[PDB]
Design a protein around this ligand. Structure first.
Ligand SMILES: Cc1cn([C@H]2C[C@H](O)[C@@H](COP(=O)(O)OP(=O)(O)O[C@H]3O[C@H](CO)[C@@H](O)[C@H](O)[C@H]3O)O2)c(=O)[nH]c1=O
Ligand SMILES: Cc1cn([C@H]2C[C@H](O)[C@@H](COP(=O)(O)OP(=O)(O)O[C@H]3O[C@H](CO)[C@@H](O)[C@H](O)[C@H]3O)O2)c(=O)[nH]c1=O
Ligand SMILES: Cc1cn([C@H]2C[C@H](O)[C@@H](COP(=O)(O)OP(=O)(O)O[C@H]3O[C@H](CO)[C@@H](O)[C@H](O)[C@H]3O)O2)c(=O)[nH]c1=O
Ligand SMILES: Cc1cn([C@H]2C[C@H](O)[C@@H](COP(=O)(O)OP(=O)(O)O[C@H]3O[C@H](CO)[C@@H](O)[C@H](O)[C@H]3O)O2)c(=O)[nH]c1=O
Ligand SMILES: Cc1cn([C@H]2C[C@H](O)[C@@H](COP(=O)(O)OP(=O)(O)O[C@H]3O[C@H](CO)[C@@H](O)[C@H](O)[C@H]3O)O2)c(=O)[nH]c1=O
Ligand SMILES: Cc1cn([C@H]2C[C@H](O)[C@@H](COP(=O)(O)OP(=O)(O)O[C@H]3O[C@H](CO)[C@@H](O)[C@H](O)[C@H]3O)O2)c(=O)[nH]c1=O
Ligand SMILES: Cc1cn([C@H]2C[C@H](O)[C@@H](COP(=O)(O)OP(=O)(O)O[C@H]3O[C@H](CO)[C@@H](O)[C@H](O)[C@H]3O)O2)c(=O)[nH]c1=O
Ligand SMILES: Cc1cn([C@H]2C[C@H](O)[C@@H](COP(=O)(O)OP(=O)(O)O[C@H]3O[C@H](CO)[C@@H](O)[C@H](O)[C@H]3O)O2)c(=O)[nH]c1=O
Lengths: 292, 292, 293, 292
């Protein structure tokens, strides 16, 4: 059983004054709230029990939007991160929620998309020992956790936001962990950036020979919605796919239905109040159409 | 003395689930909140005393964002519209705020842009009798209030969302009124579709020969953020201009400064807390650069 | 086994007027490189090195100027003219001598495919040695396309070209793999009510013989076509977003050639040289010393 | 009478490999060939007699697209620039075309748009002395000719592509000249950059107190299609305006009709060949719709 965490707080300075009114994670990516994207990622990984961590001010907003998850066949819980003191804090704030389980963390502003993403997630969720992370070729690796490989394609080092990156492979905001993660996190000291770093967690596993770094190929899209510009680009990306296909990306209701976490009667009840816009009409259609 | 009103309420059924967490009027248009755009419109019209009308739930959000307006040389007040029962309710809700003064109303999701907009506004503002409104050629006039002209260019008829529009000219969401508006609004009954219509207010002035209809030329951009797609397009539009020019659209701080409503010292105090991001850096730069 | 490829890159481009009064739709850019690069890349990724480019009489020399005989990219490119855009199936009549007694593949010039493991999706189809293979893709407006209907078991049961009342939301994309039966099939075709020699009629002949494989191309793949002004803009934006995020380029023939070992490192450095004053040349250079997984 | 020149040559290296296929000025901007835009600019300035200069290979292609211009009420002529040796060569190549007339040069890859652009053009075009150029605030002045002003608003220096710009005002790719330009261009020698510079022509006028630098306000769009990114952005801009308005930008047939250079019957005849598409349909619509 893997438990899931969505880390959806974080500093808002950058996006002010746009996000003076709204935390980044509540802004729409095209036609739905940003949080639906990472939420769908956990769902596609087969995870139904999820802890959403956000700021004292946004946590109540998330609860209002998403409730307890029961309408979607999920178990959502919530916790507050008082200060954005680092990704790895997720595992301290989430210690009691995780228990003795395996886990997965996804970042609030990370959007993934592509063919057979469900299988890629399935493959990582099924390795019960160590940790799995994903490496993606990017233009500006200095902005991210960076992973270096040897001549044989094997991962050999990690560095957080290196001044002189050793590769162009970023470690994306999606992480699968075994039961070792909490104690690793508990032992960390803040980096010089003043954060409790997920890269330090991932390095702990790498130093024990227990970090699986899978390449997320260039056929996938991995987008960061963290700037005004990237938020725009991501909206256009989603729009182009949805308008071409007549299918929506990261509709939790659809995913719950396809996974059999809710039945047709439940989906029909979710479509009603949204019946007057394209979203509800979309849900209704999924009841009478086979989609492969 | 002309007072301003921003009508910033409205139903969110359309934009759900994106606007399930945030109403249309608080969503960013690229890099700043939507309400900054119509606010800037009033400011460019020389209006400093402005009433913001929103939903019960949104008024405190607007208040948090904007305060009393004193930081920007403005006098901002707030009122609530309990149900989106028509644009003309603005004059009932704002009857006391208006007093015996002239007024202007702008719609919360309307974004205007172009060369000599400030002169177009000033001219309408200087007309102390009757009403003034603006007509703009559009592709789908059936979505809007539509104004018909005779062979000599005189406005002859108005119709709200006509099934068979008489022209391709939409009446935009920006209206200037004399003291007659409140009593005209007070005598209106709701339309078949159940709204107290701005088009009916406008028709009352037309039928007395006191409605001025100015053509807003194709050189201007008049956009609305009413839909997912149009918000995306409005974001791209603003981004292209800002990134080309190194100037921002609808920064209230800048407009206030340029209009002499706040001095250099006040502008510097506004920029400090935003100094870590591009918006604060922008305000500071405005103190040392002459922009024509 | 060798399969031979065909790009159908003709037509009038009427929907794109007046932009296509200047150039063939297939020479217009999609973001940073000519549209034709994209379908060409698709054939290359299917392991196909010998490719006939069919175009209008006026545009044929323009493609010859851009691409040449293909030898610098390790390919064998040839050209033939379609006098009038009288149907996709005409590709097999125009290309009959080119095809000879070989397996073939046709890709449409304004079709742009992208996604994870597309390379393997192409290789599975290209490596078959019998029947026809085509791809079904869920779309919003199936009435604009060849449409495939399935029974409750997932089996293809009918094909209709541009149906006013589509039987499903699955379009048959502009990518087709054929065995040696196709030329004789095409030869017996008559113009449809639309006035064309239809690929859909070709595909129905295979279906009738139980020899049509319809593979679903899932929603994780992007299949776009640049037929409208709007569509072409959106395709450019899509490529741009990917390229700017990744530091990698989509459908660079020089890269794909180098990766398939059809050209060597020295060959690539040579291609990069004349292009080095721009970002595209710089990227080719970077590929010589960067391992990309 | 002023005569016009469109410099539509150059290598277009920044656009490789797209411009291996085609001259940059033959590539579409959204819906019509790039060259329509600068052509429309000249036409909007009242100019009917225009010389189009391009490369040896492309000049014939422009002749094929546009012909002798008689069908649009113009007199279009062509000349080859053997090598892209500087904007000022347009005055040498075009020496005989110009004769003893006033002239104007517009760059092939520059796109202007905005309210009262026609009046802005008319003012400059109708002057009968000196040189007129336009200054536009930009984010990256180092890429352009840069004009500096004194405290009084008076232009005091010009630099081409300065590493350390003295201002954020670029001199755009539109230039109006009296009879002095040809002899000025004749005396120029190639710059450090290896080019016969328009900026050198402009400084010759500035030295004699005969350069009018007019500010093109932030209300106007001035874009150029020189990078892949900027060509994309220009296309989206045009698209947004065209789809909102149901009007098209830079349609030569329209402009010619509005200026009375062609009549209705002439216009019907031009739409006929284009009727099966949205562009022909638009021309037809112009015959029976009054557009203010
Ligand atoms: C630091 C911090 C962040 N966050 C949230 C905010 C965002 O949704 C998300 C990521 O924050 P950002 O600030 O975009 O990304 P950043 O924290 O610089 O980088 C992280 O995210 C990258 C992937 O996006 C990784 O490559 C880096 O290794 C990792 O450290 O996590 C929190 O909820 N709490 C925090 O304390
Ligand atoms: C099912 C579903 C998927 N997605 C997103 C998740 C992924 O980013 C992307 C693609 O979904 P995936 O299920 O990973 O892959 P997809 O291309 O649909 O491929 C599936 O469908 C193909 C066609 O039947 C099969 O041949 C593949 O074996 C199968 O994996 O779409 C959604 O946003 N919502 C969904 O309801
Ligand atoms: C009806 C109503 C609307 N609103 C807000 C929501 C939006 O910011 C703005 C406009 O409402 P919408 O419903 O987008 O636009 P719509 O109401 O269809 O039409 C209005 O706005 C159009 C232009 O935007 C005009 O051409 C029409 O004449 C006028 O009736 O007004 C309110 O705040 N309260 C309301 O009662
Ligand atoms: C007439 C015409 C114009 N344009 C371009 C030129 C400009 O970049 C932009 C706006 O055209 P202009 O004629 O400069 O300006 P516009 O905003 O239409 O304003 C005009 O129309 C207004 C409304 O009737 C008048 O109040 C103004 O006096 C008049 O100048 O559109 C075209 O691309 N094609 C056209 O046919
Ligand atoms: C009819 C015809 C087309 N062409 C070129 C033009 C384009 O690159 C490409 C496709 O032409 P279009 O007119 O977009 O596509 P269209 O003929 O409507 O539809 C075809 O392509 C669709 C996929 O794009 C399929 O779903 C249909 O079954 C198929 O008939 O083929 C030619 O070169 N010659 C032709 O005779
Ligand atoms: C190699 C290459 C690919 N492409 C396009 C074709 C596809 O649309 C898209 C993805 O390329 P593909 O090779 O199909 O798939 P990609 O996501 O890179 O996955 C590969 O790379 C993965 C990461 O190492 C491997 O796990 C996979 O087994 C392998 O198939 O990129 C290009 O445009 N140019 C190229 O040079
Ligand atoms: C040098 C040269 C250029 N051209 C064409 C190419 C373009 O359509 C147009 C401009 O060329 P570009 O090289 O993009 O623009 P660039 O030459 O960097 O700069 C010019 O254009 C800038 C405005 O776009 C100005 O601000 C500069 O003062 C001016 O020198 O002229 C020619 O046809 N022949 C030429 O010799
Ligand atoms: C001053 C200012 C303007 N704007 C918006 C309002 C308009 O949509 C657009 C253009 O502003 P306007 O002031 O109406 O027009 P603009 O093009 O700057 O033209 C001005 O500046 C020109 C150049 O000095 C003068 O020749 C004109 O007479 C003058 O009106 O920019 C802002 O968003 N922020 C601002 O601070």
């Amino acid at each position: 059983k893997r438990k899931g965490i969505i880390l959806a707080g974080g500093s808002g300075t950058r996006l002010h004054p746009a996000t003076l009114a709204i935390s980044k994670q509540l802004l729409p990516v095209y036609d739905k709230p940003m949080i639906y994207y990472p939420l769908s990622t956990l769902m596609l990984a087969g995870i139904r029990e999820i802890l959403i961590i956000s700021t004292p001010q946004d946590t109540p907003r998330f609860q209002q939007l998403l409730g307890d998850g029961s309408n979607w066949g999920l178990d959502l819980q919530y916790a507050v991160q008082p200060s954005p003191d680092g990704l790895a804090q997720a595992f301290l704030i989430g210690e009691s929620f995780i228990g003795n389980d395996l886990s997965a963390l996804v970042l609030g502003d990370n959007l993934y998309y592509g063919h057979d993403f469900h299988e890629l997630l399935g493959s990582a969720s099924q390795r019960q020992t160590g940790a799995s992370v994903f490496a993606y070729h990017v233009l500006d690796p200095e902005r991210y956790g960076v992973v270096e490989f040897d001549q044989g394609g094997k991962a050999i080092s990690l560095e957080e936001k290196p001044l002189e990156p050793k590769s162009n492979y970023a470690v994306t905001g999606l992480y699968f962990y075994d039961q070792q993660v909490v104690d690793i996190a508990r032992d960390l000291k803040p980096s010089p950036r003043g954060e409790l770093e997920i890269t330090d967690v991932n390095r702990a596993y790498l130093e024990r020979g227990q970090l699986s770094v899978e390449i997320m190929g260039r056929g996938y899209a991995w987008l960061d919605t963290g700037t005004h510009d990237s938020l725009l680009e991501a909206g256009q990306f989603i729009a182009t796919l949805e308008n071409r296909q007549g299918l929506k990306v990261a509709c939790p209701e659809e995913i719950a239905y396809r996974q059999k976490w809710i039945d047709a009667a439940q989906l029909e009840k979710l479509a009603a109040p949204l019946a007057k816009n394209g979203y509800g009409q979309y849900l209704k259609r999924l009841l009478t159409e086979t989609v492969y």
